[PDB]
Amino acid sequence: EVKLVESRGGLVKPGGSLQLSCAASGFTFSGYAMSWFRLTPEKRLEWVASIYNGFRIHYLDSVKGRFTISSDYARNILYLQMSTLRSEDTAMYYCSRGDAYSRYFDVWGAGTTVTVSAAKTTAPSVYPLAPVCGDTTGSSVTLGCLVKGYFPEPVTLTWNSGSLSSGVHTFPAVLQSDLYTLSSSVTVTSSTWPSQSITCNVAHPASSTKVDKKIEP
């Protein structure tokens, strides 16, 4: 078929450099405005740069002088050389081919994650969240798990090793002190807990750590 095969992204420190790339599959760049776009952490879609027929090259102001877009029209591979990387450059990057005649983008590469941070691999601290006194009552009770201070993303969290899948809400991670923090809640009938056990299981592949925390009154 017709597609764009993207390269792996990566983690880099501020001021560092990194190169992304996409190989055409089923077509040639000849005639297209090959470009790069990015979805920011705030969820805004931004155009980054484009290169048309070798010389029509354009850049977003914020990246002029730091990012260089280039193309190997012989091998049909698009490149984005990122240098002087800043924290604000953290985002999901996508390469896409722009029709030079209608100016739309039909073929897109899968998103490539780029993270700019000074943080070093750090395993999370997993804290159990037990209900306050007088709230363990009611027809149902809610327990929680706080996963704090880890890097980089992601972590995988389950309750009772997956047996407890319903009534769970695991929230998106947020940054604080350059490290990620996430939380998860699980709601069960007051009958179950505490008599029965409820455990929070957190895996963080980056640090090869697997932590289990039982929620006790």
Ligand X SMILES: N[C@]1(C(=O)c2ccccc2)[C@@H]2CC[C@@H](C2)[C@H]1c1ccccc1
Residues in touch with ligand [O-] (CB under 6 A): 52, 56
What does the angle CA 5 – CA 95 – CA 7 come to, to the nearest 5 degrees? 40
Interface ranges with another protein (CB under 8 A)? 37, 39, 43-47, 50, 58-61, 94, 96, 98, 102-106, 108-111, 125, 127-133, 135, 142, 144, 146, 148, 169, 171-174, 176, 181-183, 185, 187
Per-residue b or e along 190-216, where b marks 16 or more CB atoms closer than 10 Å to that residue's CB? eeebeeeebbbbbbbebeebebebebe
Residue 212 binds which of ligand [O-], another protein, ligand X, none (CB < 5-8 A, kind-dependent): none
Contact status: 100 vs ligand X (CB under 6 A):
yes
71 lies in the site for ligand X, by CB under 6 A: no
* Binding partner of 171, given ligand [O-], ligand X, another protein, none, CB within 5-8 angstroms per partner class: another protein
Among candidate residues 68, 94, 74, 77, the one with its CA nearest the CA of residue 9: 94
Binding site for ligand X (CB under 6 A): 33, 50, 52, 56, 58, 98, 100, 103
